[PDB]
Design a protein around this ligand. Structure first.
Ligand code: KY8
Ligand code: KY8
Lengths: 342, 342
């Protein structure tokens, strides 16, 4: 299928084993911003669900399907590929909703639905929005969407902004300099120092931060889920031209994201911005191995290219330059292996 | 090969990817008790290495191979299956030891060695000794061992003892009881409570503790690496009969291990006991889902059975009973996915 074609088997095995744990579902359920905002978006747009047909893509515990049932849905197909499906089925029986929620085990790229749906709901966002490549499954699910059907969430915005954080930058060399020792128990390790540095800088940094580190207004890249095709996410090119609001050393780019549920009654936003309450997505920072000096009023221009790989993630390429000086920095990160710094 | 036949491919992929990171090698090398004790064992038994042939099983960075070279070895074959092999070769060239240390990339079950060896050295101990199933690779390497050849380490002792720790039990139980909620955002989760508790209680707890929690003298199970066959580790049965020294609630069993390097000059011990300075193995505790009340002078009898699985780990069954009352507890733990509590 489409999923098997884009995913190495080892990665899929690990991924669905991970999501088969109740502790992981629980971790996501306990994110109050996430769960509360989803419930609110669904219940306050009750006309988009009352007596409607719903598809829940990757239902996990089934929480969103139960929210759709609370809003009056007639029939909800809840698709889930990990062993969590079995758990979801138990919940459906214990909440007396067997006539309204049908759990379907398997991948949404491989299962069958008995009918087309009025609305698709899902929680397909990973770190930096795109991690885990679940958005593609979400977009794939539009083969089951009736003409003029809706999607919750409806659109996604990724934000990027340059930051300064001298201590974060320094920590990488401090860790790597373990190898810059000529007699570790009699062994000269120094020839690996460079490799160590490289390894640490290929990891995106997952945590939160004070907004005062941001040096320019963010640039936005938008995916409209009603319109986008799976193939649009294999190569994501984000050009940027920042007008520097503060002078300093740019140590890298920070990323966050919002999604919007565009309903008939109201639009509801779920934001992971550093100006908003913390979520379990935090924010993501990609460091430059060579920082760039910038003056307030200078322009920092370049490109962030995200190239989808078969490990359900992206290879990140960031090229940036300060236009007033021509000083450049290029960087390659592996989004599959972030550094959880919180 | 033997390795591929006993190992799922997804697990092997993840395992060797994990050991390909310099940060992980660094973490293990920085355990000074481990590294220092290995160097001491090898250097103080220099006659076991001087002008000898050595096989280093899973050399990683190559540190033990460098130790063997310091002790005067003539030739060291250092076998490594992750990409760390490449890094090891770098070090071998930068320490001017190309004439003595030969890095051989691949699994020790699959490579070819040009000659038989006088001594096999390795660091094959995981959490609770047996995790990672690396001991079997170590034992497999005995196909290259000359008659009357030695192994470093030479023997392993696993220790088990009953413990009381109300706070640990309560912390796990509280995490599980999220799934006892009858109205999580209006949804009844309580039918999964039993599942939740099972999941949480099958993760062994990796951390250290004060020895005052131990309620009886430890029982010892010994594996002699000079004598054991690979097959002996597929099913490890450890019967136990504890004489309770203190009254209270037995919340589970604590595990640690020692290894001995039995050399021609002296025997050197590396201990992970809670009475000894801390190592990065810590100690491991398997909790009982239902604790057992015991009085001082009672006998707590049963069996710990470890069944090797294809995920490079073991399914652990612990059955224990207080003989004086017939109170029993049965437990299944998944050693592959511990809870790292430190
Ligand atoms: N709301 C219900 C839980 C939604 N889960 C959200 C994960 C993203 N969350 C997150 N949070 C913090 C940091 C990073 N990421 C994802 C769930 O979708 C399931 N699945 C993923 N692909 C699937 C596929 N192609 N076919 C069927 N099922 C699929 C998956 O097995 C998981 O159970
Ligand atoms: N000191 C030297 C580094 C030794 N590494 C020690 C592991 C210690 N485990 C542990 N666990 C918890 C806490 C602390 N330590 C293990 C290394 O052996 C490598 N490997 C594993 N199987 C192999 C195979 N069948 N054939 C070839 N290579 C093999 C592995 O790739 C790793 O690099």
């Amino acid at each position: 299928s489409v999923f098997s074609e884009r995913t190495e088997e080892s990665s899929a095995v690990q991924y669905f084993q991970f999501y088969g744990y109740l502790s992981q579902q629980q971790n996501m359920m306990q994110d109050y911003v996430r769960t509360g905002t989803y419930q609110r978006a669904i219940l306050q747009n009750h006309t988009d669900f009352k007596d409607k047909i719903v598809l829940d893509v990757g239902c996990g515990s089934g929480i969103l399907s139960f929210f759709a049932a609370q809003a009056g849905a007639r029939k909800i197909y809840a698709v889930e590929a990990s062993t969590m499906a079995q758990h979801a089925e138990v919940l459906v029986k214990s909440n007396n909703l067997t006539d309204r929620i049908v759990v379907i085990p398997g991948k949404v790229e491989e299962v069958s639905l008995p009918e087309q749906v009025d609305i698709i709901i899902s929680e397909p966002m990973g770190y930096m929005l795109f991690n885990e490549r679940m958005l593609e499954s979400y977009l794939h699910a539009k083969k089951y969407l009736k003409p003029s059907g809706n999607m919750f969430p409806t659109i996604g915005d990724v934000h990027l902004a340059p930051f300064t954080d001298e201590q974060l930058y320094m920590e990488q060399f401090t860790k790597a300099n373990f190898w810059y020792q000529p007699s570790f128990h009699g062994v000269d390790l120094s020839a690996l120092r460079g490799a160590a540095v490289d390894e640490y800088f290929r990891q995106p940094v997952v945590d939160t931060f004070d907004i005062r580190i941001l040096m320019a207004k963010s640039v936005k890249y938008t995916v409209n889920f009603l319109e986008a095709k799976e193939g649009d996410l294999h190569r994501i090119e984000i050009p940027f031209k920042f007008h520097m609001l503060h002078s300093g050393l740019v140590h890298g780019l920070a990323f966050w994201f919002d999604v919007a549920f565009i309903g008939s009654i109201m639009t509801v936003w779920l934001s992971t911005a550093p100006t908003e309450p913390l979520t379990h997505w935090y924010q993501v920072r990609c460091l430059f191995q060579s920082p760039l000096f910038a003056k307030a009023g200078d322009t920092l221009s370049g490109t962030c290219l995200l190239i989808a790989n078969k490990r359900q993630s992206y290879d990140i390429s960031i090229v940036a330059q300060v236009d007033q000086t021509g000083s450049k920095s290029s960087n390659l990160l592996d989004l599959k292996n972030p550094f959880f710094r919180y």
